[PDB]
């Protein structure tokens, strides 16, 4: 959210570094980004079972 001239709240993509790098294609993947933000996930066992 950023303030518009009139005073209304506008919704911008954002320049957040993880987001900026991801969106620009400079560095990063969504799966990798979620690794610092969202809960990791399921691991594989060595047998391959989850």
């Amino acid at each position: 959210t950023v303030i518009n001239r009139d005073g209304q709240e506008e919704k911008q993509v954002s320049f957040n570094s993880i987001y900026m790098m991801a969106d620009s294609g400079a560095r990063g993947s969504a799966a990798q980004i979620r690794q610092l933000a969202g809960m990791r996930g399921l691991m594989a066992k060595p047998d391959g079972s989850i």
Binding site: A31, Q32, Q35, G41, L42, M43, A44, I50
Partner: peptide
């Protein structure tokens, strides 16, 4: 986890 279900 990441790569290789690891990551």
């Amino acid at each position: 986890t990441x790569x290789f279900x690891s990551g």
